[PDB]
C-alpha cells in the first residue's frame, strides 16, 4: 500500500512539469476535474519504486522495462493499494 503526496509542487519543480492541473486549485477547477490531482508521472514512479523492491528484492538493475496506464486520477494524500502479479 502507498499514499499520494500532500502537494504536487515538489514533484513539479523536480520533474520540470509545472502542469497547473496538479498545483493550482483554479486551473484544476477550470478543467472541471476533481481537483489538483497527483502528477501521473509521480504515480508511475511511485509504483515503479514499489515493484523495484517488492518484485526485484530491491535490486535496481533488474527492471528493464515498465509501462503503465493512467486509468484513473488520484487526488493528493490518497492512500493507494496495489497488487503485483
Amino acid at each position: 500500500t502507498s499514499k499520494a503526496p500532500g502537494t504536487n509542487e515538489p514533484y513539479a519543480i523536480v520533474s520540470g512539469d509545472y502542469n497547473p492541473i496538479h498545483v493550482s486549485r483554479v486551473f484544476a477547477a477550470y478543467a472541471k476535474l476533481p481537483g489538483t490531482i497527483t502528477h501521473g508521472m509521480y504515480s508511475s514512479a511511485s509504483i515503479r519504486a514499489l515493484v523495484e523492491e517488492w518484485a526485484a528484492n530491491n535490486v535496481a538493475a533488474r527492471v528493464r522495462a515498465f509501462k503503465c496506464d493512467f486509468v484513473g486520477m488520484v487526488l493528493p494524500n490518497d492512500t493507494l493499494q496495489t497488487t503485483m502479479e
Binding site: 523492491e53 517488492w54 528484492n57 530491491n58 535490486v59
Partner: protein, 336 residues
C-alpha cells in the same frame, strides 16, 4: 440532619469546615455528574476504584473549577488523611495502594486519579524535603546515569504519559524547548518533512507522525534528551530541589551513547534558568547530530526477503546496529 459525602460503591467522607458545606456541595454536584456509571467493581479505567482514588479524582476536579480556598484545604486534608510525616510520599502512597484488596490492582488507575491530580491541584511544592535516601550524607553515594539512543521500541509514549501526568511541572520548560526547536526546525528541512511540533503531538495524539518517522534519528535523538531532561526536572521539583543543589548531592554522573549530553548539562546546571539555557544548548546540539548522522548515512529501503527472514528467525527488524548477547568479546571479534 447532617448526612454523608458518598459515591458509587466506595466512599471517603471527610469533615469539611462546618461553615463550608454549602459551596462544598456545589463542587460535589458538578463532580458527581462527571463520573461514569460504576462497573462491577469499577473495572472501567476512568472510574476510581479505591476511596483514596475517588478523593483524588475529586481533588483534581475541583482544581480546575473556579473555586479556590477549597483546593488547598482539601489538599492538606488528603495529606493528613493519608500522608502524615510522609506527606511527600504520594508516589510511595500510590505504589502501596497497589497492594489493597478493596482495590483491584492496576497501576494505570493509580498513576492518574492520584498522582496526576495531586500535582495538578497542589500549590507550590517548594517544601525542601529530605534527600534521605542520602540522609547518610556521609555514607551513601548517588550517581545519575542517562540512557542512550534506542533502548526501547516505542519511546515517545514515555513522554506522552509524563506530560499527561506532571503537566504542571514540565509545561514551563518543554514549551521553551519546542520553541527553540521550531527556530531550528526548518533550517534542517528536507530530512524531517513531517515537522517537529512536539507540543502539537502531545496536545493532539492524532497529529503525531507514525512511530517510524518518530523512530527516525533526526526525530528520536532530540526527544530522548527531552525525556531525560523532563525526568530530571521532575525529580528536582517533586523534592523542590534547585538543579544545582540536587547536583551537589550527587558524587558523579555520566551518560550512555546519547544521553551523555544530558549528563554534561547537569554538571553545568546551577539554577532553573541556567538549566533551561543548557538544555537549549543540548537539544540544539542533538538536533544537529540527528540531522547530520542521517544526511551522512541515510537509511534506505531493505529487500523484503531479508527482513521477512530475519523476523521469521526471531531476530529484529534489521537496523544499522546489532546487539549480541551471551558471547564474549574474543569470539564475537572472531566471527566479525
Amino acid at each position: 440532619r447532617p448526612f454523608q459525602l458518598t459515591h458509587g460503591s466506595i466512599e471517603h467522607t471527610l469533615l469539611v469546615p462546618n461553615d463550608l458545606f454549602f459551596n462544598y456541595s456545589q463542587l460535589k454536584d458538578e463532580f458527581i455528574k462527571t463520573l461514569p456509571e460504576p462497573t462491577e467493581g469499577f473495572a472501567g479505567d476512568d472510574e476510581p476504584s479505591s476511596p483514596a482514588e475517588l478523593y483524588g479524582k475529586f481533588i483534581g476536579f475541583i482544581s480546575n473549577a473556579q473555586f479556590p480556598q477549597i483546593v488547598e484545604l482539601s489538599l492538606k486534608d488528603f495529606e493528613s488523611r493519608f500522608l502524615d510525616n510522609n506527606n511527600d510520599n504520594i508516589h510511595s502512597f500510590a505504589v502501596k495502594l497497589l497492594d489493597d484488596e478493596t482495590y483491584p490492582t492496576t497501576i494505570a488507575k493509580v498513576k492518574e486519579n492520584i498522582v496526576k491530580n495531586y500535582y495538578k491541584a497542589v500549590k507550590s511544592i517548594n517544601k525542601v524535603e529530605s534527600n534521605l535516601l542520602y540522609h547518610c550524607k556521609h555514607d551513601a553515594k548517588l550517581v545519575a546515569i542517562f540512557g542512550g539512543q534506542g533502548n526501547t521500541d516505542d519511546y515517545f509514549e514515555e513522554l506522552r504519559e509524563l506530560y499527561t501526568l506532571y503537566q504542571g511541572l514540565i509545561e514551563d520548560l518543554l514549551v521553551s524547548i519546542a520553541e527553540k526547536l521550531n527556530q531550528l526546525h526548518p533550517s534542517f528541512d528536507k530530512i524531517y518533512t513531517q515537522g517537529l511540533n512536539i507540543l502539537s503531538w502531545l496536545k493532539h495524539p492524532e497529529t503525531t507522525p507514525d512511530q517510524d518517522y518518530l523512530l527516525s534519528v533526526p526525530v528520536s535523538c532530540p526527544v530522548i534528551c527531552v525525556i531525560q531532561l523532563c525526568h530530571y526536572t521532575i525529580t528536582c521539583k517533586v523534592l523542590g530541589l534547585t538543579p544545582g543543589e540536587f547536583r551537589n548531592s550527587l558524587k558523579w554522573s555520566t551518560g550512555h551513547s546519547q544521553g551523555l549530553v544530558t549528563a554534561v548539562t547537569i554538571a553545568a546546571s546551577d539554577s532553573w534558568d541556567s538549566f533551561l539555557k543548557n538544555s537549549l544548548t543540548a537539544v540544539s546540539l542533538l538536533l544537529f547530530i540527528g540531522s547530520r548522522c542521517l544526511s551522512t548515512y541515510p537509511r534506505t529501503s531493505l529487500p523484503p526477503t531479508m527482513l521477512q527472514d530475519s523476523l521469521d528467525n526471531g531476530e529484529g527488524r534489521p537496523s544499522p546496529m546489532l546487539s549480541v548477547r551471551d558471547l564474549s568479546i574474543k569470539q564475537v571479534e572472531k566471527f566479525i
